[PDB]
Design a binder for this molecule. Sequence first.
Ligand code: HEM
Ligand code: CAM
Length: 408
Amino acid sequence: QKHRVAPPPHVPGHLIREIDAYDLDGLEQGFHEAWKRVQQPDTPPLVWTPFTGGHWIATRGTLIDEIYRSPERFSSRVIWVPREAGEAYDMVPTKLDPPEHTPYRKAIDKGLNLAEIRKLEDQIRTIAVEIIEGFADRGHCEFGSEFSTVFPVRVFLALAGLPVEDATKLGLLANEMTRPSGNTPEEQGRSLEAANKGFFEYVAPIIAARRGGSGTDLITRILNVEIDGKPMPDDRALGLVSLLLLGGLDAVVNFLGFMMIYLSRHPETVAEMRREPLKLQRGVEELFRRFAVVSDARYVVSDMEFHGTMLKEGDLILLPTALHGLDDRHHDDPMTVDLSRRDVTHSTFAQGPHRCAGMHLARLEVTVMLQEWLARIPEFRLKDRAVPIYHSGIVAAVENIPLEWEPQ
Ligand code: HEM
Ligand SMILES: CC1(C)[C@@H]2CC[C@@]1(C)C(=O)C2
């Protein structure tokens, strides 16, 4: 049964569209394909859905980009739908606007900046190689369970100085954050609340132990950056360390799944990467344009008119980032990966002050993955008649990716 909310007085009937972000129409054909169904040639730039507590959806890249760049008009005080889940959300600094946001982003950047991430290249490669060598000679693997859910998790837990045996419990918490269970806005609120508490419980003893610590891990490094000339307060620390874990463990895992399904269906594109290693390296951003996974929200700060649409203070707008990278008004033939594409502009990492702090790490993980994969498994395909299983939500997910190849 679908839960509907009635539209508020300011929402006109002509803008109403029945779109369920947690179970998109057509999702069985793919997450990206399902979102693209919403973006028809004449659909309005902002449409309102009665599902998920009732909210707006931005349907074009220019709006998505503009909203992310405009925190004074579109606040991060709520960035999840439904509203109940967004109000329960307690991660730092994603819940903050400038200027409160900036010293915390500065702290994170101390650990995740490009120069710091470059130092990680060989550790990441060693991890990728070890995993790939486990199955490269076999001629088949289920890519999700055997690689994409393994590689980025081992990378991040190592970087954070945490036991790999914690992967399962952290993954379960991530699932309920980004794809909370429930068929009602209040049920999803409760699911997110419990997940966020689980993260806080996990992170608290680590914080207590690493304050003033001498560890070289990511958490110690960021935790001990001063905020306004003082140690970071406890409440902020819980949200900050929890966000590092959530950011590091869900998005890349799912991104790799979507990317690999495409590559398994496009051997010409794989072959180009093999023949021209610089095309691979320079082409990674095109993969980020094509395989967006995040759809999150902003809070309308004041009554306003925006792109010809009347908005009220407190309205939530969902930003499905796939609708920037795949917007046909921004990119010709947007569903094809063209490694030589000159304009790859996208909001896969969002825009503005919150633009992904882990983007350098994400790019490096993907680059290293493709390099070590193609070195050992140069050609591959999706198993005949295989059907991947898709999930939509704040972060998209995919599973069941059986790959086959002739061992080289
Ligand atoms: C495919 C990979 C990734 C994608 C698509 C992605 C996407 C995003 C997006 C859209 C945001 C903006 C959220 C918002 O404010 O609405 C964000 C923020 C953030 N991401 Fe990533 N992310 C990825 C990987 C990572 C990784 C590996 C980390 C490592 C810790 C990370 C850490 C963060 C952090 C800390 C923020 C908050 C930055 C701030 O609020 O100033 N992300 N990410
Ligand atoms: C939307 C995100 C990808 C970004 C980092 C992790 C995530 C789930 C957040 O809560 C903010």
